[PDB]
mmCIF file of C-alpha atoms in Angstrom:
data_model
loop_
_atom_site.group_PDB
_atom_site.id
_atom_site.type_symbol
_atom_site.label_atom_id
_atom_site.label_comp_id
_atom_site.label_asym_id
_atom_site.label_seq_id
_atom_site.Cartn_x
_atom_site.Cartn_y
_atom_site.Cartn_z
ATOM 1 C CA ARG A 8 102.053 139.657 75.910
ATOM 2 C CA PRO A 9 101.093 138.460 79.423
ATOM 3 C CA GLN A 10 102.562 134.904 79.677
ATOM 4 C CA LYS A 11 100.739 133.151 82.557
ATOM 5 C CA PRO A 12 98.152 134.038 85.244
ATOM 6 C CA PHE A 13 99.373 136.748 87.649
ATOM 7 C CA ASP A 14 101.992 137.944 85.157
ATOM 8 C CA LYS A 15 100.417 141.219 84.058
ATOM 9 C CA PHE A 16 97.682 143.221 85.840
ATOM 10 C CA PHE A 17 95.443 145.982 84.458
ATOM 11 C CA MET A 18 94.807 148.588 87.126
ATOM 12 C CA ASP A 19 92.564 151.652 87.559
ATOM 13 C CA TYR A 20 90.269 153.334 90.116
ATOM 14 C CA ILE A 21 86.575 153.964 89.556
ATOM 15 C CA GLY A 22 84.193 156.475 91.163
ATOM 16 C CA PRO A 23 83.954 158.615 93.183
ATOM 17 C CA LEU A 24 80.850 156.670 94.178
ATOM 18 C CA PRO A 25 78.130 157.484 96.718
ATOM 19 C CA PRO A 26 79.497 156.925 100.228
ATOM 20 C CA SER A 27 78.911 153.302 101.278
ATOM 21 C CA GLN A 28 80.141 152.642 104.833
ATOM 22 C CA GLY A 29 82.763 155.366 104.228
ATOM 23 C CA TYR A 30 83.881 153.878 100.891
ATOM 24 C CA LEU A 31 83.937 155.958 97.716
ATOM 25 C CA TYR A 32 86.324 154.241 95.294
ATOM 26 C CA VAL A 33 87.047 150.764 93.858
ATOM 27 C CA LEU A 34 90.508 149.713 92.761
ATOM 28 C CA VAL A 35 89.836 147.428 89.738
ATOM 29 C CA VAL A 36 92.631 144.919 88.996
ATOM 30 C CA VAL A 37 92.217 142.601 85.976
ATOM 31 C CA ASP A 38 94.565 139.669 85.282
ATOM 32 C CA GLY A 39 95.902 139.904 81.698
ATOM 33 C CA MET A 40 95.697 136.171 80.899
ATOM 34 C CA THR A 41 92.429 134.999 82.369
ATOM 35 C CA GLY A 42 90.526 138.270 82.633
ATOM 36 C CA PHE A 43 89.991 137.631 86.331
ATOM 37 C CA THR A 44 88.845 140.808 88.101
ATOM 38 C CA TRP A 45 89.758 141.789 91.676
ATOM 39 C CA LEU A 46 87.558 144.550 93.161
ATOM 40 C CA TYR A 47 89.226 146.252 96.198
ATOM 41 C CA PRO A 48 87.047 148.993 97.737
ATOM 42 C CA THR A 49 88.939 152.061 99.052
ATOM 43 C CA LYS A 50 88.234 155.448 100.671
ATOM 44 C CA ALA A 51 90.841 157.237 98.498
ATOM 45 C CA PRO A 52 92.456 156.806 95.045
ATOM 46 C CA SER A 53 95.766 156.980 96.909
ATOM 47 C CA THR A 54 99.148 155.271 96.778
ATOM 48 C CA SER A 55 98.836 154.189 100.434
ATOM 49 C CA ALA A 56 95.526 152.410 99.778
ATOM 50 C CA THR A 57 96.876 151.023 96.469
ATOM 51 C CA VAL A 58 99.927 149.532 98.258
ATOM 52 C CA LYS A 59 97.558 148.049 100.851
ATOM 53 C CA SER A 60 95.362 146.230 98.328
ATOM 54 C CA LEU A 61 98.287 145.060 96.192
ATOM 55 C CA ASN A 62 100.035 143.740 99.278
ATOM 56 C CA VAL A 63 97.023 141.438 99.689
ATOM 57 C CA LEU A 64 96.825 140.471 95.984
ATOM 58 C CA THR A 65 100.594 139.947 95.624
ATOM 59 C CA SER A 66 100.446 137.627 98.590
ATOM 60 C CA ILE A 67 99.268 135.117 95.956
ATOM 61 C CA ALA A 68 101.751 136.123 93.237
ATOM 62 C CA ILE A 69 104.098 138.962 92.318
ATOM 63 C CA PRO A 70 103.500 140.215 88.733
ATOM 64 C CA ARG A 71 106.275 141.098 86.334
ATOM 65 C CA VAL A 72 104.339 144.124 84.970
ATOM 66 C CA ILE A 73 101.546 146.511 86.043
ATOM 67 C CA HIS A 74 99.573 148.653 83.544
ATOM 68 C CA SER A 75 97.517 151.683 84.662
ATOM 69 C CA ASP A 76 96.137 155.202 84.127
ATOM 70 C CA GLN A 77 98.054 158.393 84.910
ATOM 71 C CA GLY A 78 96.092 159.019 88.129
ATOM 72 C CA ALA A 79 98.194 160.494 90.947
ATOM 73 C CA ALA A 80 98.050 157.165 92.874
ATOM 74 C CA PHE A 81 100.138 155.375 90.255
ATOM 75 C CA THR A 82 102.689 158.052 89.211
ATOM 76 C CA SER A 83 103.870 158.755 92.782
ATOM 77 C CA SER A 84 107.475 158.507 94.009
ATOM 78 C CA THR A 85 106.489 156.085 96.780
ATOM 79 C CA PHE A 86 104.745 153.743 94.336
ATOM 80 C CA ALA A 87 107.823 153.429 92.110
ATOM 81 C CA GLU A 88 110.032 152.573 95.107
ATOM 82 C CA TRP A 89 107.451 149.946 96.050
ATOM 83 C CA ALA A 90 107.519 148.384 92.571
ATOM 84 C CA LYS A 91 111.332 148.549 92.119
ATOM 85 C CA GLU A 92 111.659 146.739 95.475
ATOM 86 C CA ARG A 93 108.987 144.136 94.664
ATOM 87 C CA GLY A 94 110.742 143.699 91.292
ATOM 88 C CA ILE A 95 107.640 144.778 89.380
ATOM 89 C CA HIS A 96 107.914 146.849 86.179
ATOM 90 C CA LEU A 97 105.588 149.821 85.640
ATOM 91 C CA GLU A 98 103.679 150.860 82.511
ATOM 92 C CA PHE A 99 101.280 153.699 81.614
ATOM 93 C CA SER A 100 98.921 154.433 78.715
ATOM 94 C CA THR A 101 96.400 157.218 78.016
ATOM 95 C CA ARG A 113 89.810 150.317 75.494
ATOM 96 C CA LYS A 114 87.985 147.137 76.618
ATOM 97 C CA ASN A 115 88.591 148.498 80.114
ATOM 98 C CA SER A 116 86.321 151.453 79.245
ATOM 99 C CA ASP A 117 83.140 149.408 78.698
ATOM 100 C CA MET A 118 83.745 147.220 81.761
ATOM 101 C CA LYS A 119 84.513 150.082 84.162
ATOM 102 C CA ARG A 120 81.531 152.112 82.911
ATOM 103 C CA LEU A 121 79.145 149.156 83.384
ATOM 104 C CA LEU A 122 80.603 148.583 86.844
ATOM 105 C CA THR A 123 80.127 152.237 87.776
ATOM 106 C CA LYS A 124 76.485 152.202 86.644
ATOM 107 C CA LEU A 125 75.931 149.135 88.855
ATOM 108 C CA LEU A 126 77.523 150.441 92.033
ATOM 109 C CA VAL A 127 75.916 153.897 91.661
ATOM 110 C CA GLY A 128 72.557 152.163 91.201
ATOM 111 C CA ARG A 129 73.015 150.728 94.735
ATOM 112 C CA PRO A 130 74.063 154.012 96.394
ATOM 113 C CA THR A 131 74.081 152.965 100.090
ATOM 114 C CA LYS A 132 74.624 149.192 99.744
ATOM 115 C CA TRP A 133 77.262 148.897 97.021
ATOM 116 C CA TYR A 134 80.068 148.121 99.437
ATOM 117 C CA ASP A 135 78.130 145.059 100.713
ATOM 118 C CA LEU A 136 77.343 143.887 97.167
ATOM 119 C CA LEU A 137 80.883 144.432 95.902
ATOM 120 C CA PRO A 138 81.920 140.742 96.558
ATOM 121 C CA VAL A 139 78.823 139.547 94.687
ATOM 122 C CA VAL A 140 79.744 141.835 91.760
ATOM 123 C CA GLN A 141 83.259 140.426 91.509
ATOM 124 C CA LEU A 142 81.964 136.838 91.821
ATOM 125 C CA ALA A 143 79.333 137.328 89.089
ATOM 126 C CA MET A 144 81.751 138.959 86.581
ATOM 127 C CA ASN A 145 84.395 136.295 87.167
ATOM 128 C CA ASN A 146 81.769 133.541 86.741
ATOM 129 C CA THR A 147 80.249 134.813 83.534
ATOM 130 C CA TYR A 148 80.867 133.328 80.096
ATOM 131 C CA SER A 149 83.134 135.622 78.073
ATOM 132 C CA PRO A 150 82.464 135.055 74.326
ATOM 133 C CA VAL A 151 86.075 136.143 73.636
ATOM 134 C CA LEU A 152 87.708 133.675 76.037
ATOM 135 C CA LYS A 153 85.165 130.820 75.510
ATOM 136 C CA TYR A 154 85.149 130.187 79.284
ATOM 137 C CA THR A 155 84.614 132.182 82.510
ATOM 138 C CA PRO A 156 87.644 133.984 83.969
ATOM 139 C CA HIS A 157 87.234 131.885 87.154
ATOM 140 C CA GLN A 158 87.454 128.640 85.080
ATOM 141 C CA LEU A 159 90.672 129.961 83.547
ATOM 142 C CA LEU A 160 92.153 130.792 86.974
ATOM 143 C CA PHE A 161 91.148 127.800 89.074
ATOM 144 C CA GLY A 162 91.012 125.113 86.341
ATOM 145 C CA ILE A 163 88.355 124.476 83.688
ATOM 146 C CA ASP A 164 87.376 121.044 85.109
ATOM 147 C CA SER A 165 87.924 121.960 88.769
ATOM 148 C CA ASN A 166 85.118 121.384 91.220
ATOM 149 C CA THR A 167 83.833 124.948 91.629
ATOM 150 C CA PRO A 168 82.804 126.342 95.016
ATOM 151 C CA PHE A 169 79.194 126.577 93.753
ATOM 152 C CA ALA A 170 76.551 123.892 93.747
ATOM 153 C CA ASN A 171 73.973 125.753 91.683
ATOM 154 C CA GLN A 172 76.105 127.067 88.793
ATOM 155 C CA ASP A 173 73.096 128.856 87.298
ATOM 156 C CA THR A 174 72.549 130.902 90.492
ATOM 157 C CA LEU A 175 76.099 130.910 91.964
ATOM 158 C CA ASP A 176 74.499 129.915 95.313
ATOM 159 C CA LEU A 177 72.798 133.329 95.565
ATOM 160 C CA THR A 178 69.505 133.463 97.490
ATOM 161 C CA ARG A 179 68.880 137.147 98.350
ATOM 162 C CA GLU A 180 66.575 138.664 95.719
ATOM 163 C CA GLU A 181 68.658 141.851 95.281
ATOM 164 C CA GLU A 182 71.772 139.735 94.629
ATOM 165 C CA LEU A 183 70.020 137.726 91.883
ATOM 166 C CA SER A 184 68.893 140.982 90.281
ATOM 167 C CA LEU A 185 72.579 141.855 90.098
ATOM 168 C CA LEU A 186 73.544 138.489 88.564
ATOM 169 C CA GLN A 187 70.822 138.480 85.865
ATOM 170 C CA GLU A 188 71.910 142.004 84.861
ATOM 171 C CA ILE A 189 75.672 141.304 84.760
ATOM 172 C CA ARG A 190 75.337 138.100 82.694
ATOM 173 C CA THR A 191 73.180 139.876 80.084
ATOM 174 C CA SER A 192 75.165 143.109 79.665
ATOM 175 C CA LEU A 193 78.825 142.451 80.571
ATOM 176 C CA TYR A 194 80.172 141.666 77.090
ATOM 177 C CA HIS A 195 77.366 142.275 74.565
ATOM 178 C CA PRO A 196 75.911 145.732 75.465
ATOM 179 C CA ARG B 8 84.689 116.308 105.995
ATOM 180 C CA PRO B 9 85.301 119.093 103.344
ATOM 181 C CA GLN B 10 84.365 118.322 99.701
ATOM 182 C CA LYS B 11 85.531 121.546 97.940
ATOM 183 C CA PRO B 12 87.776 124.618 98.398
ATOM 184 C CA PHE B 13 85.608 127.342 100.036
ATOM 185 C CA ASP B 14 83.446 124.943 102.053
ATOM 186 C CA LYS B 15 85.015 125.528 105.441
ATOM 187 C CA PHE B 16 87.372 128.190 106.797
ATOM 188 C CA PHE B 17 89.464 128.099 109.974
ATOM 189 C CA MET B 18 89.827 131.545 111.481
ATOM 190 C CA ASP B 19 92.002 133.093 114.179
ATOM 191 C CA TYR B 20 93.974 136.254 114.865
ATOM 192 C CA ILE B 21 97.622 136.380 115.900
ATOM 193 C CA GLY B 22 98.982 139.208 118.056
ATOM 194 C CA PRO B 23 99.433 141.800 119.239
ATOM 195 C CA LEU B 24 102.764 142.135 117.433
ATOM 196 C CA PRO B 25 105.451 144.881 117.459
ATOM 197 C CA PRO B 26 103.890 147.709 115.424
ATOM 198 C CA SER B 27 105.135 148.345 111.882
ATOM 199 C CA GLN B 28 103.323 150.408 109.191
ATOM 200 C CA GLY B 29 100.533 151.045 111.764
ATOM 201 C CA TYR B 30 99.407 147.419 111.959
ATOM 202 C CA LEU B 31 99.305 145.292 115.152
ATOM 203 C CA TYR B 32 97.400 142.058 114.341
ATOM 204 C CA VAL B 33 97.055 139.456 111.554
ATOM 205 C CA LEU B 34 93.863 137.581 110.800
ATOM 206 C CA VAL B 35 94.935 134.147 109.591
ATOM 207 C CA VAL B 36 92.349 132.359 107.411
ATOM 208 C CA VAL B 37 92.864 128.720 106.362
ATOM 209 C CA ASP B 38 90.858 126.699 103.832
ATOM 210 C CA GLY B 39 89.501 123.362 105.182
ATOM 211 C CA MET B 40 90.149 121.348 101.997
ATOM 212 C CA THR B 41 93.372 122.770 100.606
ATOM 213 C CA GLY B 42 95.260 124.237 103.579
ATOM 214 C CA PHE B 43 95.683 127.465 101.573
ATOM 215 C CA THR B 44 96.362 130.426 103.876
ATOM 216 C CA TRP B 45 95.256 134.074 103.649
ATOM 217 C CA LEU B 46 97.046 136.441 106.043
ATOM 218 C CA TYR B 47 95.304 139.792 106.539
ATOM 219 C CA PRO B 48 97.249 142.602 108.260
ATOM 220 C CA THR B 49 95.017 144.414 110.750
ATOM 221 C CA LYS B 50 95.010 147.134 113.445
ATOM 222 C CA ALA B 51 92.768 145.384 115.977
ATOM 223 C CA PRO B 52 91.379 141.872 116.633
ATOM 224 C CA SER B 53 87.960 143.417 115.951
ATOM 225 C CA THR B 54 84.802 142.277 114.147
ATOM 226 C CA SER B 55 85.033 145.405 112.011
ATOM 227 C CA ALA B 56 88.343 144.219 110.547
ATOM 228 C CA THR B 57 87.233 140.577 110.173
ATOM 229 C CA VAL B 58 84.307 141.677 107.986
ATOM 230 C CA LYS B 59 86.694 143.873 105.946
ATOM 231 C CA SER B 60 89.164 141.075 105.230
ATOM 232 C CA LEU B 61 86.388 138.512 104.646
ATOM 233 C CA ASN B 62 84.639 140.730 102.099
ATOM 234 C CA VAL B 63 87.823 140.711 100.003
ATOM 235 C CA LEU B 64 88.053 136.970 100.540
ATOM 236 C CA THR B 65 84.378 136.077 99.982
ATOM 237 C CA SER B 66 84.581 137.920 96.632
ATOM 238 C CA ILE B 67 86.076 134.716 95.248
ATOM 239 C CA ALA B 68 83.320 132.617 96.886
ATOM 240 C CA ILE B 69 81.079 132.344 99.951
ATOM 241 C CA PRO B 70 82.323 129.724 102.439
ATOM 242 C CA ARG B 71 79.573 127.377 103.612
ATOM 243 C CA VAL B 72 80.931 127.102 107.187
ATOM 244 C CA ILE B 73 83.516 129.019 109.260
ATOM 245 C CA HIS B 74 85.441 127.408 112.154
ATOM 246 C CA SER B 75 86.751 129.753 114.835
ATOM 247 C CA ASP B 76 87.755 130.131 118.491
ATOM 248 C CA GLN B 77 85.115 131.928 120.596
ATOM 249 C CA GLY B 78 87.131 135.181 120.439
ATOM 250 C CA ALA B 79 85.322 138.503 120.710
ATOM 251 C CA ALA B 80 85.561 139.298 116.986
ATOM 252 C CA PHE B 81 83.769 136.086 115.975
ATOM 253 C CA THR B 82 81.229 136.002 118.840
ATOM 254 C CA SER B 83 79.687 139.475 118.467
ATOM 255 C CA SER B 84 75.981 139.593 117.528
ATOM 256 C CA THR B 85 76.722 141.627 114.375
ATOM 257 C CA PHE B 86 79.285 139.114 113.048
ATOM 258 C CA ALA B 87 76.513 136.609 113.721
ATOM 259 C CA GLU B 88 74.229 138.758 111.550
ATOM 260 C CA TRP B 89 76.932 139.338 108.913
ATOM 261 C CA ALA B 90 77.263 135.553 108.457
ATOM 262 C CA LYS B 91 73.509 134.939 108.707
ATOM 263 C CA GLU B 92 72.680 137.198 105.747
ATOM 264 C CA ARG B 93 74.865 135.264 103.285
ATOM 265 C CA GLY B 94 74.061 131.770 104.632
ATOM 266 C CA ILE B 95 77.246 130.864 106.489
ATOM 267 C CA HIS B 96 77.127 128.576 109.526
ATOM 268 C CA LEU B 97 79.493 129.525 112.349
ATOM 269 C CA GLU B 98 81.403 126.766 114.108
ATOM 270 C CA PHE B 99 82.520 127.340 117.666
ATOM 271 C CA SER B 100 84.331 124.465 119.410
ATOM 272 C CA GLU B 112 92.784 121.252 116.292
ATOM 273 C CA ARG B 113 96.470 120.978 117.333
ATOM 274 C CA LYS B 114 97.721 121.476 113.752
ATOM 275 C CA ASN B 115 96.208 124.977 113.315
ATOM 276 C CA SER B 116 97.799 126.132 116.595
ATOM 277 C CA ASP B 117 101.173 124.579 115.718
ATOM 278 C CA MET B 118 101.272 126.931 112.735
ATOM 279 C CA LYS B 119 100.084 130.027 114.665
ATOM 280 C CA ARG B 120 103.036 129.730 117.053
ATOM 281 C CA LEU B 121 105.265 129.027 114.046
ATOM 282 C CA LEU B 122 103.964 132.218 112.433
ATOM 283 C CA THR B 123 104.083 134.509 115.481
ATOM 284 C CA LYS B 124 107.787 133.730 116.021
ATOM 285 C CA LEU B 125 108.530 134.600 112.372
ATOM 286 C CA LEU B 126 106.701 137.930 112.666
ATOM 287 C CA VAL B 127 107.892 138.938 116.154
ATOM 288 C CA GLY B 128 111.427 138.002 114.939
ATOM 289 C CA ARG B 129 111.504 140.992 112.581
ATOM 290 C CA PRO B 130 109.673 143.601 114.749
ATOM 291 C CA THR B 131 110.143 146.479 112.274
ATOM 292 C CA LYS B 132 109.965 144.561 108.991
ATOM 293 C CA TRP B 133 107.230 141.905 109.268
ATOM 294 C CA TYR B 134 104.317 143.773 107.613
ATOM 295 C CA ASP B 135 106.241 144.214 104.335
ATOM 296 C CA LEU B 136 107.289 140.555 104.543
ATOM 297 C CA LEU B 137 103.734 139.370 105.258
ATOM 298 C CA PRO B 138 103.045 138.761 101.530
ATOM 299 C CA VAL B 139 106.308 136.792 101.329
ATOM 300 C CA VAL B 140 105.398 134.745 104.407
ATOM 301 C CA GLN B 141 102.116 133.729 102.764
ATOM 302 C CA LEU B 142 103.696 133.097 99.357
ATOM 303 C CA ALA B 143 106.104 130.650 100.980
ATOM 304 C CA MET B 144 103.427 128.924 103.067
ATOM 305 C CA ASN B 145 101.039 128.267 100.175
ATOM 306 C CA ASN B 146 103.925 127.201 97.909
ATOM 307 C CA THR B 147 105.762 124.697 100.102
ATOM 308 C CA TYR B 148 105.216 120.934 99.630
ATOM 309 C CA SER B 149 103.077 119.465 102.420
ATOM 310 C CA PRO B 150 103.798 115.823 103.508
ATOM 311 C CA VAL B 151 100.169 115.353 104.638
ATOM 312 C CA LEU B 152 98.762 116.715 101.361
ATOM 313 C CA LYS B 153 101.428 115.430 98.913
ATOM 314 C CA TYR B 154 101.078 118.832 97.173
ATOM 315 C CA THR B 155 101.553 122.561 97.879
ATOM 316 C CA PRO B 156 98.292 124.305 98.891
ATOM 317 C CA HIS B 157 98.564 126.650 95.852
ATOM 318 C CA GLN B 158 98.353 123.511 93.701
ATOM 319 C CA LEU B 159 95.243 122.451 95.634
ATOM 320 C CA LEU B 160 93.345 125.755 95.251
ATOM 321 C CA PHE B 161 94.375 126.653 91.711
ATOM 322 C CA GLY B 162 95.037 123.194 90.159
ATOM 323 C CA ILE B 163 97.698 120.454 90.408
ATOM 324 C CA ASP B 164 98.439 121.456 86.834
ATOM 325 C CA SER B 165 97.871 125.175 87.526
ATOM 326 C CA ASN B 166 100.459 127.622 86.330
ATOM 327 C CA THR B 167 103.120 128.186 88.938
ATOM 328 C CA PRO B 168 103.092 131.648 90.627
ATOM 329 C CA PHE B 169 106.880 131.998 90.151
ATOM 330 C CA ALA B 170 109.835 131.159 87.898
ATOM 331 C CA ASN B 171 112.019 129.280 90.411
ATOM 332 C CA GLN B 172 110.952 126.637 92.955
ATOM 333 C CA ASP B 173 113.990 127.348 95.193
ATOM 334 C CA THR B 174 113.850 131.162 95.409
ATOM 335 C CA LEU B 175 110.205 131.894 94.490
ATOM 336 C CA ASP B 176 111.529 134.888 92.541
ATOM 337 C CA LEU B 177 112.928 136.324 95.807
ATOM 338 C CA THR B 178 116.239 138.181 96.140
ATOM 339 C CA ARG B 179 116.236 140.280 99.350
ATOM 340 C CA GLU B 180 118.027 139.099 102.520
ATOM 341 C CA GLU B 181 115.051 138.708 104.913
ATOM 342 C CA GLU B 182 112.951 137.079 102.188
ATOM 343 C CA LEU B 183 115.536 134.324 101.550
ATOM 344 C CA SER B 184 115.968 133.940 105.337
ATOM 345 C CA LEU B 185 112.200 133.629 105.825
ATOM 346 C CA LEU B 186 111.798 131.165 102.972
ATOM 347 C CA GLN B 187 114.471 128.863 104.425
ATOM 348 C CA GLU B 188 112.916 129.119 107.915
ATOM 349 C CA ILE B 189 109.462 128.428 106.494
ATOM 350 C CA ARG B 190 110.802 125.466 104.481
ATOM 351 C CA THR B 191 112.883 124.153 107.427
ATOM 352 C CA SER B 192 110.247 124.271 110.160
ATOM 353 C CA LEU B 193 106.711 124.188 108.699
ATOM 354 C CA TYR B 194 106.066 120.426 108.871
ATOM 355 C CA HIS B 195 109.001 119.397 111.079
#
């Protein structure tokens, strides 16, 4: 039903999480086509924060549809006026999101103080992990299967810090087959 | 000298600008290889905000080197420690990245009340305009020459509003001329 990359996004908040540099929530945005995940950390599951993050993301491309939960952030009057102006169509429903979000929450809660700093590494690892459904990584599907990737050591994603490898090894093993 | 996208970034703020939606500055980040541009709307030309925007950015990948002017944001000892930790070399010192800053400022200043909401449109038009030097748009260079196009129409870029279509024409008229 999504036609190309950046055509349909799947959107929800996770947390609340332990405070990490004043951050408590993560807006998770998954591309329908490629499965590419954008992790935007926020201080509030709000519309204002949501419009901030999406203004960054939609700098790349404006979707035709957005799918979400019924959280207050997404049902708001100001959010609809934002969509209708951007041209975007809205959609609500309350599956595969469940497993992914739950795994992500376990990971970020397991790094109570640091999780904000390790966020980028989390997003990188999940996007560069073989999905047995897609037969490629979501990064490969977004940037080109044969493209020269920004990583030399594909095995290690150019990660050197021992706590960041611990993250990678764990994500690869448990992301799709629990 | 760049081999891949995400090898080298060129960084610099633009501002202060007339304040809309609370924001005063815009961190402009440009990719060495592809010329792809990320504009980040900010409150201050601070280190704090550079880190914030770069954490979103470096989610996609760690850049190996970052080129920047010796502005306060980039020269603080903590931004030196923030880059150190994840193995990024900082490059303190060329006309072509300043020719675009001035080209950008005048587009933003031009709509003193509107610019922040048009920021995403500004970027969308920059990364999706054919470059003479490159022979391709920078979106094509980051995502693939054969990458899916981030729009339905090459002329409009799926844009309808008055300022958008004004911007797009200005951006297409003046970028490389």
